């Protein structure tokens, strides 16, 4: 006879869980993003240097 | 009772490693290939045997052979996680690519491929015990999965003939596509698999693709989703042989329930609620929305428009929290409502089951864990459609002779082309008839 | 992506050429229908 | 009530105000009315504050 | 695909009262207050049925 | 570079207690 | 969403623009290097519209300009902001049409439209959903008049659904640089009242009188009169960047505005604009907008407006208002001087507000009335088209390049039964 | 027994924001969404502590939608249900009916679809829009047309937004306000009129805020909607349903064109002098200096009346008073209607909101009409419309857009034939 309403509520903070790690991942794609940034901002300074 | 699963061409065995995935997840089998724990909630014990099949001692070794003509997927496979899981063996790698060629992979290199897949194949079928039946995934737009899969299929008919034989097939879709002859590969691998596969069932990408933008928001999704949403389908169609229920129904069921006539067996799959972590918390799930889900065709995984078709038979496995109550008022609603219609030589056209086992969630995966879960699959008049739009696309190439030195040179003859088309035509035709 | 470079040439205008013309007006092809039946009449 | 009925026919404090025709005839919230008068004096005062 | 560990799953029939009994069963019985009936003392009235 | 669970049989091949 | 990509022309076109996106830049917070640097919140989510997130934090514009002489672009990558154009979208020539209508028109365009049209259209498919086009040229010069009218004939031939702004100087006999200014003025006019959307006519006389009267400058350089101009468009499209009450697009005041697909030529003021002497001595509500914002004096246009009938008018207004100020004030303004107001028309003003002011005010607007007093102006220019057609006077130059005789008899039966139009709704 | 209510156009939600702020104060409703059966008829209780409310927030134009999903409802909103197109309508009704429409109709027509298979007992649906605008006029006008060959006999509560007489902000609004017409006579089952120069000068003369924005107009709209709906939610001594204002306040099919009033709307300081009883709140609901259209009632004859009550309120004073009314001769009935009233009681007083104007009343009434100065109303819009396509105005838009004068000629003619049947019956 269906499900007890303690298995709903760990299914329920399972879900919320899973939606903590959505936003964790979200913020590791925006410090990777700012990562790739930074590298390509020291071999345009290298270019930079290497036409002077 | 136990099922084995063969996997052709690229995107078949990419299919089928996000299935083995979900399975080995599933039931709490390590990546090493031993289970730690005997506790095993489930249905019971002994549930893997119809998937694994218990080795040595401590030990899974898969029921399942990859194979493909080019080497770099099996070695990357090879090189991945799942070393020590699948035997060495079980994974089959040619040399030389089969190269969007139909003929090229029917009649070159499938000669040399074919034998050896086959006495493989043989010796697990032997091992195997109460052998329910074969589960084909492979792609037909590609080289591989048509021309060899073509010819694996014809040589299992012949082997076993009548034991069932599942082909989740992936389709090209209307415009989408990533190939520029697979309506030439299509058409010649439909000849085969018309009379050779019992219950086949499409898979376009475009549906999927509509899926994951609208439900699960994803702005940039890649095969991998795919992938799992497929492997989350099959497994909730094989959750009733491998855990318990209210109401189960095996391999046998399908071709029981859903194919009217011998020769119309194409389904129309579907799967709700596809739903991600913010609009788990936010929509309420009862099997009243989900059932209507299911039928509404934004939910699915092949691109057509039943409304301007009529359904011949559908098939309901609800995975979860299911109680048979609800369910029936949910199908007496959906028979009751109007803007779906049923064909008149069919009155009663719904066949339900149920198991108690949740559907699994795969960390990293985007979809969240619910209550409940429906998986349709229908039969209808949206299929000679699809047939008939890329017949359409294939006859405008084939007036102008185009491509076809290609498939002469490996060996296929013109007059295929003609036959293939005019089999394609009689299809059509026996859809429409049987659809009056 | 455009047209070639040569044919990316001007051409003249004239008095009207980009006016709009605006046909007679006439009774339409899909008419709206009436639903709700006329309010009865005062004498009966 | 005609289609909803959370209160009961006879419940006190319903009975209580409609008895007292006092309340009935007139009714106020003294303490309320003078918060939203005051309410609304902060408000003019606000806006006069921002255009100073 | 990196290697990974499924959540830990409940056993089916947790959150449940156990049929231990509390030496009454679960089912509240009638609430009343006592009362001398008319003529014979000792009865009992049910102020909640 | 985790090791595995042998059989018991394998694990324990030669192996003998003596008295 | 909506997306507004934008064309200089030209020298007057390129130093607008260059203020243009420094009044931009600056209402978005956004710092000349190109990085932001503002407070709200309410400032990024609308910088789609102008700019694009290139990598790490950098808003580069939307623009193109265009011109063939670097004398303009030197000027405007001089000074500050202006290091944040794309090079890629800076197309120029090597020769110059030297106010000369038919160079700019038959052969230099026809080596440089090309370059214009594949940077533009980059910049029009990098994005989704085009709103419009706005570009901002003269009606005097050769490569802003000329190619910019080039450039508007090509792309209303490819993308005729979107909207199209046109910010056009036209000028006047007390302010005449160019001699051949109505040999320039009338066949651009005949080419933008078949292709151009909408006209919002400037130019510089009037401009000259705001800042000698009003504003109460001593020496008003140009960069000033640009100031002005940007402030206007950023006052015509802050509806789209900004949430208001009252939404307004470039379409919905398009259709609002131009009754018949020809009369769409607008004159435009802006409010408020007082000195900084008398900036004390007033208050600040809508009545005190709306008493600057009407007057003949303070249109942007050589019109005065009670030479004739106002067709329609339209008011966006910037800052926390109360509607029913703003309304009335509309109705009242529309009751007292009713003779004004075009008859068969009732309730001529449209009218929108927004809830972002401009930085450091409290309450601001911009009107773009469409009235029938523009036919002045368009007189004012066409007796001295035929007064110098009479004697074919500096024909040659225009002739020598290709143009016959017939596209200026043509250009000037547009102008004279475009005139008549006016003069027939008047 | 649930309502559902879809917003059509920029006024449209705003008037929502305004009234689900009013409704989640009404009933505890935190706006993170849960509660720290009354309910029932607007939320439904998803998943576990949380309520996401019976509506669809429909527009073309992204600007005030996604200001939705920034402001503080960003919780108690299904993401799903503010649908949104991406470019605006602009005040051109065949854009909007023919352009834009036919792409966002079919998704906004597929939710409030599983919205009514969500419900069990649908009472009704009810529309909010301003027929001023493209997109609550033109594709407003394209979904109850679909609404109806999809249900039909429902009830569809229309509280739309006319423009008024001499206070404007549009010049093409009484093209949309024709066209928008010809469907709102024959697809909507119960209309409600609502002016913005009426509810002006309420907000001035009552409420004496000299400088009444927007929030103001759709804080009291609000008020108007909660009192007319709280029958459902609020259990009342003699509540009447949604079906009750077809039956009594619909002499014939054609003729649903509802005034709408409420009282008392009053300060918080003059409430302080006022002896605020029942008699003289039913008196305030009946001047037009307290109604919510434009219009002076007295050169009309009143078809019927349906009078909401709230809070303190018992069937004998409200029995006196109407018999009051039926007893002056100031404002007069029709002849035809013998027993020209109706009247509903319910016990939950009105609520106020924090930063509203209106004081913590006890007891209210809002006014529901039918008379002949609606008649008047339309006429009036008529001759103004008349004015401007006499030299085809800004019609070069819509046939640009891909429609005829017949449309224009048969909105004209219908109209004319609306004017005729006002004046037979009040005669
Ligand atoms: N759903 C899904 N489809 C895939 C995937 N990978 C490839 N495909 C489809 O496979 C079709 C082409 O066949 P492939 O599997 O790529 O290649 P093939 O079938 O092995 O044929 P060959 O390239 O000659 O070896 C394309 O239309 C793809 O859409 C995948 O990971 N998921
Ligand atoms: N009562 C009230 N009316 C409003 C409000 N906002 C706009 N309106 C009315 O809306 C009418 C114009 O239509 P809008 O709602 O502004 O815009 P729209 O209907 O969506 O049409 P588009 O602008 O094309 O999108 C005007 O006549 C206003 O009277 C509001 O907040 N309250
Ligand atoms: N507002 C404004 N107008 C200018 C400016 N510079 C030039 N103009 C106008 O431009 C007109 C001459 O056009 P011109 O610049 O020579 O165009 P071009 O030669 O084709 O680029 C004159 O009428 C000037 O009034 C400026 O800085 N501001
Ligand atoms: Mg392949
Ligand atoms: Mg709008």
Not at chain 2, 229 to 244: G, M, P
Not at chain 2, 247 to 257: M, S
Not at chain 2, 351 to 369: F, M, S
Not at chain 7, 382 to 389: D, K, N, V
């Given at each position: 006879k269906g499900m007890t309403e303690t298995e709903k509520q760990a299914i329920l903070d399972a879900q919320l869980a899973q939606m903590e790690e959505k936003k964790a991942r979200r913020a590791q794609e925006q410090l990777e993003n700012m990562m790739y940034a930074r590298t390509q901002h020291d071999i345009q300074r290298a270019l930079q240097e290497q036409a002077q | 009772?136990?099922?084995?699963?063969?996997?052709?061409?690229?995107?078949?065995?990419?299919?089928?490693?996000?299935?083995?995935?979900?399975?080995?997840?599933?039931?709490?089998?390590?990546?090493?290939?031993?289970?730690?724990?005997?506790?095993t909630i489930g249905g019971g014990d002994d549930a893997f045997n119809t998937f694994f099949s218990e080795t040595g001692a401590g030990k899974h070794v898969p029921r399942c052979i990859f194979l493909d003509l080019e080497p770099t997927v099996v070695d990357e496979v090879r090189t991945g996680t799942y070393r020590q899981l699948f035997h060495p063996e079980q994974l089959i790698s040619g040399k030389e690519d089969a190269a969007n060629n139909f003929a090229r992979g029917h009649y070159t290199i499938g000669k040399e491929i074919v034998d050896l897949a086959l006495d493989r194949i043989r010796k697990l079928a032997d091992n195997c015990t109460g052998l329910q039946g074969f589960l084909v995934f492979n792609a037909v737009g590609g080289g591989t999965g048509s021309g060899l899969g073509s010819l694996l299929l014809e040589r299992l008919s012949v082997d076993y003939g009548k034991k069932s034989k599942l082909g989740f097939t992936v389709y090209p879709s209307p415009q989408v596509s990533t190939a520029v002859?697979?309506?030439?590969?299509?058409?010649?691998?439909?000849?085969?698999?018309?009379?050779?596969?019992?219950?086949?069932?499409?898979?376009?990408?475009?549906?999927?693709?509509?899926?994951?933008?609208?439900?699960?928001?994803?702005?940039?999704?890649?095969?991998?989703?795919?992938?799992?949403?497929?492997?989350?389908?099959?497994?909730?169609?094989?959750?009733?042989?491998?855990?318990?229920?209210?109401?189960?129904?095996?391999?046998?069921?399908?071709?029981?329930?859903?194919?009217?006539?011998?020769?119309?067996?194409?389904?129309?799959?579907?799967?709700?609620?596809?739903?991600?972590?913010?609009?788990?918390?936010?929509?309420?799930?009862?099997?009243?929305e989900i059932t209507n889900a299911a039928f509404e065709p934004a939910s699915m995984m092949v691109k057509c428009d039943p409304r301007?078709?009529?359904?011949?038979?559908?098939?309901?496995?609800?995975?979860?929290?299911?109680?048979?109550?609800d369910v029936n008022a949910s199908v007496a609603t959906i028979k009751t409502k109007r803007t779906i219609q049923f064909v008149d030589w069919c009155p009663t056209g719904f066949?339900?089951?149920?198991?108690?086992?949740?559907?699994?969630?795969?960390?990293?995966?985007?979809?969240?864990?619910?209550?409940?879960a429906v998986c349709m699959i229908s039969n209808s008049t949206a299929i000679g459609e699809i047939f008939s739009r890329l017949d359409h696309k294939f006859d405008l190439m084939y007036a102008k002779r185009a491509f076809v030195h290609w498939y002469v040179g490996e060996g296929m003859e013109e007059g295929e082309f003609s036959e293939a088309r005019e089999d394609l035509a009689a299809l059509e035709k026996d859809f429409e008839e049987v659809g009056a | 992506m455009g047209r070639p470079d040569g044919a990316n040439g001007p051409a003249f205008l004239h008095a009207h050429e980009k006016e709009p013309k605006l046909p007679s007006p006439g009774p339409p092809s899909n008419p709206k229908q009436k639903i709700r039946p006329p309010v009865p009449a005062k004498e009966e | 009530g005609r289609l909803v009925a959370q209160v009961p026919n006879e419940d006190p404090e319903r009975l209580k105000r409609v008895l007292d025709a006092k309340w009935r005839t007139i009714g106020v919230d003294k303490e309320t009315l003078e918060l939203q008068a005051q309410e609304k004096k902060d408000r003019e005062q606000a806006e006069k504050d921002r255009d100073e | 695909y990196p290697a990974k560990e499924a959540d830990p799953q409940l056993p089916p029939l947790t959150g449940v009262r156990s049929r231990?009994?509390?030496?009454?069963?679960?089912?509240?019985?009638?609430?009343?207050?006592e009362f001398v009936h008319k003529g014979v003392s000792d009865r009992y009235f049910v102020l909640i049925p | 570079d985790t090791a595995t669970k042998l059989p018991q049989w394998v694990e324990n091949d030669r192996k003998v207690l003596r008295f | 969403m909506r997306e507004i990509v934008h064309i200089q022309g030209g020298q007057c076109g390129n130093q607008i623009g260059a203020k243009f996106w420094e009044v931009v830049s600056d209402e978005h917070g956004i710092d000349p290097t190109g990085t932001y640097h503002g407070d709200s919140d309410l400032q990024l989510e609308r910088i789609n519209v102008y700019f694009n997130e290139a990598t790490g934090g950098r808003y580069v514009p939307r623009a193109i300009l265009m011109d063939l002489e670097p004398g303009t672009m030197d000027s405007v990558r001089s000074g500050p902001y202006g290091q944040i154009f794309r090079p890629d979208n800076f197309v120029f020539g090597q020769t110059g049409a030297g106010n000369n209508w038919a160079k700019g028109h038959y052969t230099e365009g026809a080596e440089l439209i090309d370059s214009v049209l594949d940077v533009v259209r980059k910049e029009a498919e990098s994005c989704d959903c085009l709103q419009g086009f706005q570009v901002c040229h003269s009606l005097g010069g050769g490569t802003g008049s000329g190619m910019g009218t080039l450039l508007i004939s090509k792309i209303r031939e490819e993308y005729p659904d979107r909207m199209m702004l046109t910010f056009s100087v036209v000028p006047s006999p007390k302010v005449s640089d160019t001699v051949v200014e109505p040999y320039n003025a009338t066949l651009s006019v005949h080419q933008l009242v078949e292709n151009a959307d909408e006209c919002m006519?400037?130019?510089?006389?009037?401009?000259?009188?705001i800042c000698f009267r009003t504003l109460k400058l001593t020496t008003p350089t140009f960069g000033d009169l640009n100031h002005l101009i940007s402030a206007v468009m950023s006052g015509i499209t802050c509806c789209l960047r900004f949430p208001g009450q009252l939404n307004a697009d470039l379409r919905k005041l398009a259709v609002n505005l131009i009754p018949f697909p020809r009369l769409h030529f607008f004159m435009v003021g802006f409010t408020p604009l007082t000195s900084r002497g008398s900036q004390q001595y007033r208050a600040l509500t809508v009545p005190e907008l709306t008493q600057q914002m009407w007057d003949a004096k303070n249109m942007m246009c050589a019109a005065d407006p009670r030479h004739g009938r106002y067709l329609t008018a339209s008011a966006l207004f910037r800052g926390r208002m109360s509607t029913k100020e703003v309304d009335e004030q509309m109705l009242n303004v529309q009751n007292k001087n009713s003779s004004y107001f075009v008859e068969w028309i009732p309730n001529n003003v449209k009218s929108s507000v927004c809830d972002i002011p401009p930085k450091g005010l409290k309450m601001s607007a911009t009107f773009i009335g469409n009235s029938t007093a523009i036919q002045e102006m368009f007189k004012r220019?066409?007796?001295?088209?035929?007064?110098?057609?009479?004697?074919?006077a500096f024909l040659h130059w225009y002739t020598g390049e290709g143009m016959d005789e017939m596209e200026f008899t043509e250009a000037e039966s547009n102008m004279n039964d475009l005139v008549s139009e006016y003069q027939q709704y008047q």
């Open positions: - | 009772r136990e099922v084995i699963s063969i996997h052709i061409g690229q995107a078949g065995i990419q299919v089928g490693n996000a299935c083995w995935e979900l399975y080995c997840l599933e039931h709490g089998i390590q990546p090493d290939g031993q289970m730690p724990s005997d506790k002859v697979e309506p030439y590969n299509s058409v010649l691998s439909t000849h085969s698999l018309l009379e050779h596969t019992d219950v086949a069932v499409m898979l376009d990408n475009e549906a999927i693709y509509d899926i994951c933008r609208r439900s699960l928001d994803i702005e940039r999704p890649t095969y991998t989703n795919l992938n799992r949403l497929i492997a989350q389908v099959i497994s909730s169609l094989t959750a009733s042989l491998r855990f318990d229920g209210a109401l189960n129904v095996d391999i046998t069921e399908f071709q029981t329930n859903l194919v009217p006539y011998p020769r119309i067996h194409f389904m129309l799959s579907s799967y709700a609620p596809i739903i991600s972590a913010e609009k788990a918390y936010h929509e309420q799930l009862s099997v009243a301007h078709g009529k359904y011949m038979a559908c098939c309901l496995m609800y995975r979860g929290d299911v109680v048979p109550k066949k339900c089951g149920i198991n108690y086992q949740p559907p699994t969630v795969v960390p990293g995966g985007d979809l969240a864990k619910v209550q409940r | - | - | 231990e009994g509390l030496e009454l069963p679960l089912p509240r019985r009638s609430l009343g207050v | - | 006519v400037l130019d510089n006389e009037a401009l000259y009188d220019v066409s007796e001295q088209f035929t007064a110098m057609f009479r004697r074919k």
